[PDB]
Amino acid sequence: WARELGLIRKPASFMTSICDERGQELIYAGMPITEVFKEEMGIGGVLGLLWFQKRLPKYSCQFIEMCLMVTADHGPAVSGAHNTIICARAGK
Amino acid sequence: SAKAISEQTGKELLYKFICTTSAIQNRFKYARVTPDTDWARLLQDHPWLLSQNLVVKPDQLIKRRGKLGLVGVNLTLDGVKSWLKPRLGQEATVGKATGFLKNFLIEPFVPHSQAEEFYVCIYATREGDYVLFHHEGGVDVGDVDAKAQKLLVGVDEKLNPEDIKKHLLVHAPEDKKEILASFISGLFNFYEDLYFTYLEINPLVVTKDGVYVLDLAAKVDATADYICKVKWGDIEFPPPFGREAYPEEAYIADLDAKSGASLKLTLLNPKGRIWTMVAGGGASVVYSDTICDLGGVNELANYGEYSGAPSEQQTYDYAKTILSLMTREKHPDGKILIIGGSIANFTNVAATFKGIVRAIRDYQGPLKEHEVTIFVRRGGPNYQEGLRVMGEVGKTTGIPIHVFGTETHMTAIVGMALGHRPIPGKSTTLFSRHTKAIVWGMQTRAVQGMLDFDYVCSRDEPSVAAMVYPFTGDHKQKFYWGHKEILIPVFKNMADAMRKHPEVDVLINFASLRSAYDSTMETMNYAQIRTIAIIAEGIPEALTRKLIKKADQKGVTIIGPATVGGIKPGCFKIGNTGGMLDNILASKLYRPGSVAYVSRSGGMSNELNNIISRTTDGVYEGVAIGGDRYPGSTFMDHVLRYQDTPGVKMIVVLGEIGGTEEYKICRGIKEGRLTKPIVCWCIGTCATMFSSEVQACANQASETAVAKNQALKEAGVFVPRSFDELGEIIQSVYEDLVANGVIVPAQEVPPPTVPMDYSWARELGLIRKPASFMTSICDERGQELIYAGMPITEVFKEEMGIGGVLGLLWFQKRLPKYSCQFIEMCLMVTADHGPAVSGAHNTIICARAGKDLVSSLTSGLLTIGDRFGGALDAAAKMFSKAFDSGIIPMEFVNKMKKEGKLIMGIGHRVKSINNPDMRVQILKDYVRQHFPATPLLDYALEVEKITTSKKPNLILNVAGLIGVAFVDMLRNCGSFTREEADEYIDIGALNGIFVLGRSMGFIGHYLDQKRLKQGLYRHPWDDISYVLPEHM
Ligand SMILES: CC(C)(COP(=O)(O)OP(=O)(O)OC[C@H]1O[C@@H](n2cnc3c(N)ncnc32)[C@H](O)[C@@H]1OP(=O)(O)O)[C@@H](O)C(=O)NCCC(=O)NCCSC(=O)C[C@@](O)(CC(=O)O)C(=O)O
Ligand SMILES: CC(C)(COP(=O)(O)OP(=O)(O)OC[C@H]1O[C@@H](n2cnc3c(N)ncnc32)[C@H](O)[C@@H]1OP(=O)(O)O)[C@@H](O)C(=O)NCCC(=O)NCCS
Ligand SMILES: Nc1ncnc2c1ncn2[C@@H]1O[C@H](COP(=O)(O)OP(=O)(O)O)[C@@H](O)[C@H]1O
Known part of the structure; x- marks a missing residue:
């Protein structure tokens, strides 16, 4: 109630610029989620907004999605997949 | 600060570090005699004593010994022994100083005449060093400044030999012209390499055999210790010859070196009743002058100050010292304690007053019967809380306490105490509303005060454009612009800051004394900076002179070192000037006035702020030039600035003792250069009433405050009778200037308001904010680290180890010693179980991925759960459930069997009955020997008897034993109730036991893989069965 009246000063300990949860609509780097779906960006456009705070061109978003697709998996023999499998088999 | 060194120290250091082609004789050839020493050792370590004739003189900072007959010349060793006795340890009187003798110096006699009596002197001035050579030196020197040849060596200039030959060696004999010149040159190099400010050898006798230094008086720049501690060694600075220094006075001097605060105390007569403890030099x-003006010269005991923002503990030390020294006598007439001072800019009045509060709480006894009345007059940061704290405490203990704020005159409490009154090119404009400054250093409180002042001054933009901090990368610091949040850039380098902010014209330098010189030199390489404020106190005077010379060359105005800075109401504030925002508002420093002032002190500058606000329109501009011997800018510089400023109408000058600086004002007002009204008061008129040379020091006779005050008076300067009359004379001059009509006071526009700080509102208890976190295991804050209510020193004294610390941190209990030992054993046996298990395997994989200790250990730890590492918890829970349900072990075995469940904690791969686990055995033996009761362990052993009857290897596991024994420890040691033990089992304390134990092994595996330099692991394809679908 003192903050609402503007009677006290308290510095904010955190800064953020990628997502605005508060308010009527969710916002991804200045862009409403309804506008995100209307403009038909997919994972690539959302990633551009959340990682770079930019509205990337469509080919950039498509390329980002393609990069995610080609690195999705490379079999169970590599170190990370091996560790994940070990942990899953530990019932974890 | 120049400090005189002993003759012995001066000659020793001179012999050790002079470098000349001249043949200097009697190197390290001297003997020190003191009353409390033997003589046989003195004979044995100095074989030169009997080799030739001797001369003895007291080395106790006494001059004019020849005119006072205190030297025994041309008399042998038995002569010096006979001559010491009437004087060694006896009373002596030189002028007004009376004191005993503890120090004498012995040196070989030098046969010489008046034909080779040579006087040499080097002393420091603002513009450089003067060398004086008198050919007819010695006692017959007479007038030296007018007859001895004088030569100036400027700042950053060399003393070259031909300069000595012509401008210094006209009257020297030709045969001795040459080598002496070389010597003189080397002497100058000795003078400036060891940071001497005064160095006179008189007489210096030179003959064909060589040169001989018979005498030398030397003052060295003490603040240069950090440069010359290697060359000086353990240099001592003798006090002036006179009364012996008190142990408490030496204590105060020792306190002065503790921190950057200034902690001074000096005595004249402890039998006096007037006792002042005033903040700010x-x-x-001013307080000493005021008490001496109205009849307290003889009855005043002490003179001293505490400043530079001393802490609570240091204030305790100073206050308890002053009370202990005050209690030495009973004065029937009564005793007073005058405490306070001006409004502080930086000194936390709250802490410095809690210090005296808690120093007088314990000193009620030995002073209440002394009839001590305490008069306080303090202002500054958090003064409204400290004043009323001390009022509460004084009323609680009952001593006479009179609490006065800033609404009263600073010296009115003096009149109350003594009963005289009832007790109730360089620019003209440095700063504007568009001035942008760079702050050198990480001073966020000062920058925020600057910004708050800018906001309440209705400035368009903040006055701080950037900060420079070399120990961090470039980033942005979050500050407040009123209630809005703004970002101010912080740069590692000056160059980037000046590149990105060409509109900055001011540098505020918060570098320490060791960094200020280099910071300021680097700053003056950027012509955009026209004004530099140096805050640091303790810069050596020679470095300051180099700064002054470069600033004069570059046309840069320097607000000299050892200053709080200055304030231009409505436009700009330097650093911490004017204190917090409440002081800014109270003195109405948010809007321009018409009176411009200059002073040396910052506390006096804030007092002037308050006075001028109370009696006139307000302050137009105030500058504190600092307490150094060579300020970057002088009184007369700022007075000239003010005269050329159409905004100012009257000029207040607050001078001090020593220095002929106000006489430049007199020559400017006696002539028509300075036309505006000037109200000047010089403090320090009590310096004459001091029977010593206490250091800000008067050198000549016209540099006393009385002479300067009278000289300004006859010059046309409005000089009050005293400081107490300064407010009224300023008021009268302003009133006449407003009756004439040159001053037209403006309408009081209310300033913008700044929201209160959250922390300050919480301290006042004005707001409520629920804490979002709860904790009960560790208290980091406070003087000592606390583990669940137990201090860390007590943790180590009680000799608990890892087990006791774990008990404190996990259960908040002081466990018995066997419990802590058992916990340690459990950690030891679960430390590792080889590299084949899932967690160790994952940790090794992650280590071989070149990853990280934390990452690898964490990768291994994330496998801890049901199938791996969870058997401790599972066994404890299963056995506890069976035991608490009341079923017998056979019923438990059958019930587990028909539920399709294996008993957790039963079973080994190879080991069986007659082939015991042997770490189950260690723990079981310990538990049997030390635990008071083990019901669950007995139950589990019965279960194990049944299961090993089924087949031999169905023994109690390490997991089973640790689980049941941990339950037994929790609920059978006296620390827990049954509910607490059950809760700790339920929330996973045994999971924590396994995790903490196995972390040791996982870290060991990480380090092992790093040491073996194992490369990236890939699982072989032949060990993987690929069962992908045909086509999805
Ligand atoms: C000048 C300064 C800011 C200097 O600051 P500090 O020295 O504290 O801090 P630092 O800059 O960090 O220097 C420390 C050195 O240790 C180094 N260091 C740090 N951490 C290190 C690590 N981990 N490892 C290695 N090294 C490390 C660091 O690098 C530095 O090294 P170096 O550069 O070589 O020095 C301060 O001291 C001072 O003088 N005044 C404060 C400001 C002010 O407003 N004054 C006027 C007050 S008006 C007054 O007096 C009247 C009165 O009192 C009257 C009354 O009472 O009424 C009143 O109030 O009105
Ligand atoms: C990319 C790079 C590692 C190629 O390595 P390489 O030694 O030519 O081949 P590999 O390290 O994959 O292994 C070589 C053999 O092991 C086999 N092998 C690979 N994974 C295996 C597994 N899990 N089990 C059994 N065999 C395996 C391969 O089939 C190959 O068989 P071959 O001997 O019949 O040719 C090497 O060129 C390099 O270090 N480049 C640097 C750039 C870089 O690191 N790029 C990253 C790659 S995305
Ligand atoms: N080592 C010495 N050899 C010869 N004469 C000395 C010696 N020391 C002092 N004197 C005599 O003392 C006189 C100088 O006195 P000085 O000590 O300078 O007085 P003050 O102590 O007042 O400065 C000289 O005239 C000199 O004859």
Whole structure:
């Protein structure tokens, strides 16, 4: 109630610029989620907004999605997949 | 600060570090005699004593010994022994100083005449060093400044030999012209390499055999210790010859070196009743002058100050010292304690007053019967809380306490105490509303005060454009612009800051004394900077002179070192000037006035702020030039600035003792250069009433405050009778200037408001904010680290180890010693179980991925759960459930069997009955020997008897034993109730036991893989069965 009246000063300990949860609509780097779906960006456009705070061109978003697709998996023999499998088999 | 060194120290250091082609004789050839020493050792370590004739003189900072007959010349060793006895340890009187003798110096006699009596002197001035050579030196020197040849060596200039030959060696004999010149040159190099400010050898006798230094008086720049501690060694600075220093006075001197605060105390007569403990050097001088003016010269005991923002503990030390020294006598007439000073800019009045509060709480006894009345007059940061704290405490203990704020005159409490009154090119404009400054250093409180002042001054933009901090990368610091949040850039380098902010014209330098010189030199390489404020106190005077010379060359105005800075109401504030925002509002420093002032002190400058606000329109501009011997800018510089400023109408000058600086004002007002009204008061008129040379020091006779005050008076300067009359004379001059009509006061526009700080509102208890976190295991804050209510020193004294610390941190209990030992054993046996298990395997994989200790250990730890590492918890829970349900072990075995469940904690791969686990055995033996009761362990052993009857290897596991024994420890040691033990089992304390134990092994595996330099692991394809679908 003192903050609402503007009677006290308290510095904010955190800064953020990628997502605005508060308010009527969710916002991804200045862009409403309804506008995100209307403009038909997919994972690539959302990633551009959340990682770079930019509205990337469509080919950039498509390329980002393609990069995610080609690195999705490379079999169970590599170190990370091996560790994940070990942990899953530990019932974890 | 120049400090005189002993003759012995001066000659020793001179012999050790002079470098000349001249043949200097009697190197390290001297003997020190003191009353409390033997003589046989003195004979044995100095074989030169009997080799030739001797001369003895007291080395106790006494001059004019020849005119006073205190030297025994041309008399042998038995002569010096006979001559010491009437004087060694006896009373002596030189002028007004009376003191005993503890120090004498012995040196071989030098046969010489008046034909080779040579006087050499080097002393420091603002513009450089003067060398004086008198050919007819010695006692017959007479007038030296007018007859001895004088030569100036400027700042950053060399003393070259031909300069000595012509401008210094006209009257020297030709045969001795040459080598002496070389010597003189080397002497100058000795003078400036060891940071001497005064160095006179008189007489210096030179003959064909060589040169001989018979005498030398030397003052060295003490603040240069950090440069010359290697060359000086353990240099000592003798006190002036006179009364012996008190142990408490030496204590105060020792306190002065503890931190950057200034902690001074000096005595004249402890039998006096007037006792002043005044904050701020200027305020202390003013209070002493005020008490001496109205009849307290003889009855005043002490003179001293505490400033530079001393802490609570240091204030305790100073206050308990002053009370202990005050209690030495009973004065029937009564005793007073005058405490306070001016409004502080930086000194936390709250802490410095809690210090005296808690120093007088314990000193009620030995002073209440002394009839001590305490008069306080303090202002500054958090003064409204400290004043009323001390009022509460004084009323609680009952001693006479009179609490006065800033609404009263600073020296009115003096009149109350003594009963005289009832007790109730360089620019003209440095700063504007568009001035942008760079702050050198990480001073966020000062920058925020600057910004708050800018906001309440209705400035368009903040006055701080950037900060420079070399120990961090470039980033942005979050500050407040009123209630809005703004970002101010912080740069590692000056160059980037000046590149990105060409509109900055001011540098505020918060570098320490060791960094200020280099910071300021680097700053003056950027022509955009026209004004530099240097805050640091303790810069050596020679470095300051180099700064002054470069600033004069570059046309840069320097607000000299050892200053709080200055304030231009409505436009700009330097650093911490004017204190917090409440002081800014109270003195109405948010809007321009018409009176411009200059002073040396910052506390006196804030007092002037308050006075001028109370009696006139307000302050137009105030500058504190600092307490150094060579300020970057002088009184007369700022007075000239003010005269050329159409905004100012009257000029207040607050001078001090020593220095002929106000006489430049007199020559400017006696002539028509300075036309505006000037109200000047010089503090320190009590310096004459001091029977010593206490250091800000008067050198000549016209540099006393009385002479300067009278000289300004006859010059046309409005000089009050005293400081107490300064407010009224300023008021009268302003009133006449407003009756004439040159001053037209403006309408009081209310300033913008700044929201209160959250932390300050919480301290006042004005707001409520629920804490979002709860904790009960560790208290980091406070003087000592606390583990669940137990201090860390007590943790180590009680000799608990890892087990006791774990008990404290996990259960908040002081466990018995066997419990802590058992916990340690459990950690030891679960430390590792080889590299084949899932967690160790994952940790090794992650280590071989070149990853990280934390990452690898964490990768291994994330496998801890049901199938791996969870058997401890599972066994404890299963056995506890069976035991608490009341079923017998056979019923438990059958019930587990028909539920399709294996008993957790039963079973080994190879080991069986007659082939025991042997770490189950260690723990079981310990538990049997030390635990008071083990019901669950007995139950589990019965279960194990049944299961090993089924087949031999169905023994109690390490997991089973640790689980049941941990339950037994929790609920059978006296620390827990049954509910607490059950809760700790339920929330996973045994999971924590396994995790903490196995972390040791996982870290060991990480380090092992790093040491073996194992490369990236890939699982072989032949060990993987690929069962992908045909086509999805
Ligand atoms: C000048 C300064 C800011 C200097 O600051 P500090 O020295 O504290 O801090 P630092 O800059 O960090 O220097 C420390 C050195 O240790 C180094 N260091 C740090 N951490 C290190 C690590 N981990 N490892 C290695 N090294 C490390 C660091 O690098 C530095 O090294 P170096 O550069 O070589 O020095 C301060 O001291 C001072 O003088 N005044 C404060 C400001 C002010 O407003 N004054 C006027 C007050 S008006 C007054 O007096 C009247 C009165 O009192 C009257 C009354 O009472 O009424 C009143 O109030 O009105
Ligand atoms: C990319 C790079 C590692 C190629 O390595 P390489 O030694 O030519 O081949 P590999 O390290 O994959 O292994 C070589 C053999 O092991 C086999 N092998 C690979 N994974 C295996 C597994 N899990 N089990 C059994 N065999 C395996 C391969 O089939 C190959 O068989 P071959 O001997 O019949 O040719 C090497 O060129 C390099 O270090 N480049 C640097 C750039 C870089 O690191 N790029 C990253 C790659 S995305
Ligand atoms: N080592 C010495 N050899 C010869 N004469 C000395 C020696 N020391 C002092 N004197 C005599 O003392 C006189 C100088 O006195 P000085 O000590 O300078 O007085 P003050 O102590 O007042 O400065 C000289 O005239 C000199 O004859």
